[PDB]
A = this chain, B = another copy of it.
Amino acid sequence: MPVEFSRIVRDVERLIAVEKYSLQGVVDGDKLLVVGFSEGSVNAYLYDGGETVKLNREPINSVLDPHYGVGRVILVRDVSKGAEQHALFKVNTSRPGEEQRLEAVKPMRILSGVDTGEAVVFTGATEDRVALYALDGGGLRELARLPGFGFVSDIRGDLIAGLGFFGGGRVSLFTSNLSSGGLRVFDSGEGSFSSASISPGMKVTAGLETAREARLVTVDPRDGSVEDLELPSKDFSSYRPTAITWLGYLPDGRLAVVARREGRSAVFIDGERVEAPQGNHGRVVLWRGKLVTSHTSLSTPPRIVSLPSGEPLLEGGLPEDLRRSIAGSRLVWVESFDGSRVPTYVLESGRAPTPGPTVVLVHGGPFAEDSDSWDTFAASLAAAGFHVVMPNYRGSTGYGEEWRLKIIGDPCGGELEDVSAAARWARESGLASELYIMGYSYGGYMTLCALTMKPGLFKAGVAGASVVDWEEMYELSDAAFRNFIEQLTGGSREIMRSRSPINHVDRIKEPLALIHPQNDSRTPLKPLLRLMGELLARGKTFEAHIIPDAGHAINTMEDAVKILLPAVFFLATQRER
């Protein structure tokens, strides 16, 4: 019967250790710029000629998008031990591992950014404002104050094109001018914008995610007119995509698009489909004349491949015994309380019987999805001998504006019912002998709402980086996170309070593991402390694990282990009974 701890650790270790890559662009002529988790930390690399050079010294969080060929990379690094107050560091690509901090920019939550080579344009959130900034030889400039999370998408000449969460959970398109500043906002009554790119004719080509469909559109930023984009191949509209992951013009004028349906993507160049390995893909770049994208799946860790051969340039290798810890995967449609079909990804473990111990692993966000993409949490549960049920509850991306916007104004409501229906299905399908719930971020919120609102549905609960109290979280949030909490609770304090697990602790009847980074600035620990005070006060059984010098965005293996390992240890111990 006994939990095999050293095996679990080794497996959890190797799944975190395995290298993971992200495609960020091309620099210095023909050098892939890739961010990768490798040698234990998140780092920036140049790839070319079957070799890598490491650009950074200390671990980083990401880099700004370089337009093709710049001659430098801008690193983004948390200088607040996890609280996501980032700084910018220039690395000249001819002198790798020598960084010059950009002292003009005081630490802030960097949201996005582009480096045109003559200037660096970025969006950032501070305690009082979200804003589009520009930094050049003439110092730093505030181009525009943004009403909510904003993300720079592209820049051509002086035109700047961005995406903005400015109300209702809807995404707006925005533009600005690199020299004169300003802000123009474009809303759609039909839906939300997904990706933007500026055409050679200075029009913004954008994805537009409508009720249950997605499509491409052209916005002229002079007059705000919106028309459909005709493409010279019809494969794109034949594919009838539900969401758009990414689009961008290549240096040769061709429009690359990556769109998806049902948690798998397809690549298109001027509308034509290009052969791509199955799963999901990231951005597409043109390098030494050939197409390159990132690729991932439930069984393959994020890697970098060439299209259409699908052959890898960089890729982390899984050992066969871990490969087999995933017997298979499947997308099933669970019927929820209101009749809605909740599209649910299922990983069958090769170390669990059927029926067997199953965990309902809930995604964060909530504007995120479970898809055919590598998930370490999920793979490690497989490894430990749990089947894994991953419900794309309402609020999820990937299934249309309608399903995504149903969560707005109703946290701990319909989306919890979706999760619950996924649990019920797990048993009734034959898959589950017992149910556990586990989740990070908003998914940890679900765990806590699961255990307060649905006592006795689940056997035990892991809640990481959780939301606990909307009210106290709001007070401790930066401008951008205040606006989003507003957007998500529909500006209601009643919802804020009533839909906070902390005010319902007396109903918990199940064991509960809490995991939290001490310096998380999104989901802070202060409320989690008060929750423990409540649990204790009311005679409830829990364990807690607070991780030092870390926040919501984990960028080292050690932090990754401290986050993941107590979850798996706790679930394995609960399986003993």
A13 adjacent to B6 (CB under 8 Å): yes
Q: How many residues of A are in contact with the other chain, CB < 8 A?
A: 36
B548 adjacent to A545 (CB under 8 Å): no
Query: How far is B9's CA from A532's CA once the two chains are assembled, in angstroms?
Result: 28
Which of B3, B536, B548, B557 is the one whose CB lies under 8 Å from A541?
A: B548
B-side contacts of A545, CB under 8 Å: 543-546, 566
B9 adjacent to A511 (CB under 8 Å): no
Q: Is A90 on the interface with B (CB-CB < 8 A)?
A: no
Determine, out of A43-51, A345-353, A518-526, the stretch whose residues face the partner at the interface. A518-526
Q: Is A81 on the interface with B (CB-CB < 8 A)?
A: yes
B569 adjacent to A511 (CB under 8 Å): no
Q: Report the minimum CB–CB distance from A567 to chain B (whole Å).
A: 13
Q: Which residue of chain B has its CB nearest to the CB of A80?
A: B539
B-side contacts of A5, CB under 8 Å: 9, 13, 557, 561, 565
Q: Is A332 on the interface with B (CB-CB < 8 A)?
A: no
B548 adjacent to A542 (CB under 8 Å): yes
Q: Is A533 on the interface with B (CB-CB < 8 A)?
A: yes
B-side contacts of A573, CB under 8 Å: 558
B-side contacts of A562, CB under 8 Å: 543, 569
B-side contacts of A536, CB under 8 Å: 518-519, 525-526, 529
B-side contacts of A547, CB under 8 Å: 543
Q: Which residue of chain B has its CB nearest to the CB of A548?
A: B543
B-side contacts of A9, CB under 8 Å: 5-6, 9
Task: Give the B-binding residues of A (Cβ under 8 A).
Answer: 2-6, 9-10, 13, 81, 511, 513, 518-519, 525-526, 529, 532-533, 536, 541-549, 557-558, 561-562, 565-566, 569, 573
Q: List 21 A-B contacts (CB under 8 A).
A: A2-B558, A3-B557, A3-B558, A5-B557, A6-B6, A81-B541, A518-B536, A518-B541, A518-B543, A519-B536, A519-B541, A525-B532, A526-B536, A529-B532, A529-B533, A541-B548, A542-B548, A543-B547, A543-B548, A545-B545, A562-B569
